[PDB]
Design a protein around this ligand. Structure first.
Ligand SMILES: Nc1cccc(-c2nnc(-c3ccccc3)[nH]2)c1
Ligand SMILES: [Cl-]
Ligand SMILES: [Cl-]
Length: 130
């Protein structure tokens, strides 16, 4: 219905705003673009499901997220990919992991403070009906 389309549009607007706040945070610059395969050529073969904030924005616009839970699964994937690609004790890896965890924690904290659970529940119940 019209009212359901309005609901998903509000969800997209909400998710774009949250993603934008993540993307302008200097800590998260490394997660704003997909990995360049001329800098780490083996990235695309190790990491089977690359995810980054540019891709998340593209998926919002393609109406791929019908719930906040769907969105957070991709934020979680940005984080978990980073933990797996950079597992070592050296400072470069530890810095990336810390930023990845912070990205994840920041998204969840924004959602906890700013998302009405009844709005999420509505999105879920529409998504289950289609
Ligand atoms: N999940 C995700 C999304 C975008 C980038 C990355 C990433 N993981 N590790 C790197 C990296 C590794 C060595 C030097 C600089 C960045 N970048 C990981
Ligand atoms: Cl840096
Ligand atoms: Cl190590």
């Amino acid at each position: 219905s019209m009212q359901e389309e309005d609901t998903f549009r509000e969800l997209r607007i909400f998710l774009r705003n949250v993603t934008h706040r993540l993307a302008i945070d200097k800590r998260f610059r490394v997660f704003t673009k997909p990995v360049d395969p001329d800098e780490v050529p083996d990235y695309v073969t190790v990491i089977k499901q690359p995810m980054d904030l540019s891709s998340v924005i593209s998926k919002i616009d393609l109406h791929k997220y019908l719930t906040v839970k769907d969105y957070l699964r991709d934020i979680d994937l940005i984080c978990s990919n980073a933990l797996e690609y950079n597992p070592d004790r050296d400072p470069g890896d530890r810095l990336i992991r810390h930023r990845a965890c912070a990205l994840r924690d920041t998204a969840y904290a924004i959602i906890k403070e700013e998302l009405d659970e009844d709005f999420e529940q509505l999105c879920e119940e529409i998504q289950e009906s289609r």
